[model samples]
Target chain A: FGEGMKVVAAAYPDLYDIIVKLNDTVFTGKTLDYKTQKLIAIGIVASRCDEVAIEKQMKSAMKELGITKEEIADVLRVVLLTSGMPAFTKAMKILEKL
Target chain B: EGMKVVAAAYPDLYDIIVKLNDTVFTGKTLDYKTQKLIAIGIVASRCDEVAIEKQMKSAMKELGITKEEIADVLRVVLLTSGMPAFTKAMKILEKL
Candidate 1:
């Protein structure tokens, strides 16, 4: 399990079901594919500065969805200006290792 | 008398908020168009009707954004934001 799952299980165990359900509903919707969903998640995570969540999503996105570093960078481009330079820089560093 | 009335009443707070807004809106790593796209995505995902209306108007007027671009951004919103928000945004986009 990833750090995010562990945190959720330990801290927000009661809400886990609903959170998972939300993920299922959002990520599996018809309008967007799973790969695009993950890419969007990557951008959202970067905007929030959630490093652990970023890693988990990045790993899954790259491994399962075949998302590349450049694609992830493209998404982070939006985060760069809106979220801040710090968040953008952090996301780039995390993507480097992943 | 409109919104700037608050600025006169609370000059420091208004200054701070305006400065922050200016800082955030200024182009650096991303241009205004790109930032607007991201803002539209975030706002759409949240399903904030007021924000959606305002940003859509700003995006259209300032950036000359098209329905196609808005739809693409909402696609991201649809995936990460949830079905309800996505549907609402789609309707808003259609109208705009």
Candidate 2:
């Protein structure tokens, strides 16, 4: 973790706990499996144009869930229309590098 | 509805948005629930309070989505969206 994250964690430990619980509940849900959930996360990160988050998510998603480049691109297609071309282009750029 | 905001601001844009919404919301390979889940994920990740609130409400009312279902979606937001975004979403979910 970075200095900021460390500080935040120290200051608000309970927040991290809630987040952990939230993750457990979300991933264990019956409706969407882990792979599907991660794909949704990829789309959300792409739409937000968060380069760091996108990179981190794409890396983890690929390694953990065997997410394909094509699937990531498919989700970005929706981001293109909803979040604009810039976000879409940025997400594509990030994907290309990986 | 507040859709008049779009209608008054950009007459053609309103129809365009509606058309896009309908097309996107239509169940293809993804299905309606999955689409809504994805939409909720996007809204939560952006931490757009208004959009998240509106989307959550719509998901609940239209699809009968329970709080647990929404929480499941928001957890993905936590991982990809950072702590701030996740907390913000949690706050909205709590409110609803």
Candidate 3:
């Protein structure tokens, strides 16, 4: 399997069962609000200096969370103000690539 | 005890609290000095009878943070945290 498939398989041996269970579960709801959750993830990953995870979360923000570039910039500003410039800059480089 | 008086003297500390809390929540990347500064700033502005003197020494000796940074932190805290509490906090900063 490729990296994506490997990640999938490694994370879930009973993936089919889990999805079926989730499909049947009514309360399979999101806990965090979409924007706040993505923002928190972005900030956490960016602060950790995990470029790959930052990119991953950025994609999640745009696709899953339905956030915009402007919102990402706003969240980035919060990261910079708290975490400082260097970490924010690294995350920005990945975002720029996107 | 702390928040009540702090709310009276320095309402800005609440904002600082949220800012510092969020900052640390997302990123464990802050310099120890920066983190310590914020902690001291909060304690100081709350008119923390106990927080000021000890943290002042710690910031200077352990963190190698300067008195100037402490002063600047206090200034920012004063604006957001409260002017009255800042007066009391400065006394502690100067004492140590």
Candidate 4:
């Protein structure tokens, strides 16, 4: 693994544990319906403005979770209205990029 | 990236941004510390009284941020987002 990967592993051991647990509960296991979870994730990320992570999640939402482009758009519109222009504009850019 | 962005969303909105500056945004202008502030404001705006109380508790203990800063952000949200949104935010802030 690269230095950065090792740093991520070592620097936040507690976070890593919580992350794996969250992954096992949410993504790996899929207890909450995957599509709905993806939509919720997108909303949370949309508010945050992490374009790289948000774009990656967008692709997963489309490819893995089987969310249609229309559904993504619907979610984005809610984000736009509630979260403001910064969230809307950046999220739309991520969608187009994907 | 600029024109393509506006165009993909609304073909008409594309025209507006076409005349604007070509800025390459990244890494979130609002830093992690600021994000917690923003979250506080969001909770306040949502009128989530319970969430506000917990957020304020954490902001003080974990981030060591001031209540005044949180109030200022909430006030900004009020002016920008409107009275109803602002009032909701204040109602939550009042708890702190």
Candidate 5:
């Protein structure tokens, strides 16, 4: 769940429901495999410097997929080149905290 | 694809881009496919159909990927990147 759920759980139940549906849709697929997509998800959120999304994805990645800090930093290596240092450094800061 | 758009006129800049991309994808920790997938995730988040389609077409064959696999990635984009990004990617996926 995103921090989005907190702000919108009561106020935007309809949108919340749709998000839940989308989350379910994305979560249930198998062709891509979990670890691979988890890394991608982490990459997407980190590029945007989304603390909540990054935090949750990071936790799931580490716990469920046994992803390591080195792997995350590797993804950020690409993020730094693609997005810029602001996003790369912010994401690194978040990763260090976790 | 995009590199060559201006590449014919200016091979120097595109060469720099190519060299930089090559350097970034050294695959020290995450491996090549994971890194490319992450790159696609980053590209798709921007909702640029041209970029994503180009990414999709190559990744499918070069990486031995499938439409379902690509769909799986875009769906997660729905979560972090929002609906427009997901939908745009899906539409391009549809074309493929």
Candidate 6:
């Protein structure tokens, strides 16, 4: 569930299925390694200042790949360049807590 | 954009950031493309049309990355950042 996903699943059953399938497809290490993909995944959510997604992605990155705060910082620094200071700092704030 | 401004406003700090960016990506050749993908994902997640457009064209032209390769990266964008984020990026990908 996507946190707000319960309502989404009930409201759009078929569309939700495609999203699940899409996740499965992308989750594979087709074009890049899973860790590489997830690290970039962290960069993506963090770039948007998505607090929930940032925590989830960062926690999972650490748990799955033992990715350190420094590694996550590498990702966020790139976000700083692409997205700007606000998004970078927002995610860094959440990361420091974790 | 800001880097150019920073260069004039504080040349010392601007030099450090430019050096820092290179230091971060200073690794395997493969990491060049890898980081570019991350750049796209980060830019796209914000749904910033201008940034994504600039990043995408740069990636393709400089690195010879194909649309299909970027599609794979964008799928990562889709799952983590969700549909609105993914949809905006996908629309831009369909064009130059």
**Which candidate achieves the best TM-score against the true structure?**
5
* Better candidate number, 2 or 4, judged by DockQ: 2
Q: Per-residue lDDT of B1-96 in model 6, one digit per residue for the tens?
A: 777899999999999888977865653333667778888887877757998889899999999988877887888887777889788888999997
Off by over 4 Å in 2: A1-26, A50-74, A92-98, B26-28
lDDT of 5 by residue, A1-98 (tens): 54657788889989888878877778776677777777888888888856777788888799888999889988988888778889988899988999
Model 6: pairs clashing at backbone N, Cα or C within 3 Å: none
Tell me the deviation in Å of residue A23 in model 6.
2.0
Considering the two chains of model 4, state its CAPRI-style docking category: incorrect
Instruction: State the lDDT of candidate 1 residue by residue for A41-87, as single tens digits.
Output: 67766777568888887888888878778777766766774567898
Docking class of 5: medium
Q: Compared with the true structure, what per-residue lDDT tens digits does model 3 show for residues B52-87?
A: 777788779987877766675555445434668668
| Residue range with the least summed lDDT across 10 consecutive positions in model 1 chain A | A25-34
lDDT tens digits, residue span B1-96, model 2: 789898998889999988877765554355667667777888888846998899899999999988877887877887766789889988999999
DockQ for every model, please: 0.14, 0.30, 0.03, 0.03, 0.65, 0.44
* Best by the lDDT measure: 5
TM-scores of all candidate predictions against the true structure: 0.57, 0.69, 0.41, 0.45, 0.80, 0.71
DockQ winner among the candidates? 5
lDDT of each: 0.71, 0.79, 0.60, 0.58, 0.82, 0.81
Supply the TM-score of chain A against the true chain A for every candidate structure: 0.78, 0.83, 0.68, 0.73, 0.74, 0.79
Q: DockQ for the candidate 4 complex?
A: 0.03
Q: Which stretches of candidate 3 lie over 4 Å from their true place?
A: A1-5, A8-32, B1-96
Cα DockQ of the candidate 5 complex: 0.65
Candidate 3, residue A33: CA error in Å?
A: 1.8
- Tell me candidate 1's TM-score on chain B: 0.87
Instruction: For candidate 6, write residues A1-98 as lDDT tens digits.
Output: 44566777989989888877876788785567677888888887887746988898899789878888877887876777777789888998999999
Q: Is the docking of candidate 2 incorrect, acceptable, medium or high quality?
A: acceptable
lDDT of model 5 at residue A94?
87
Over B7-86, each residue of candidate 4 has an lDDT whose tens digit, in order, gives: 88888666554432112111123233444554555455455567677877787788876766665555444432457866
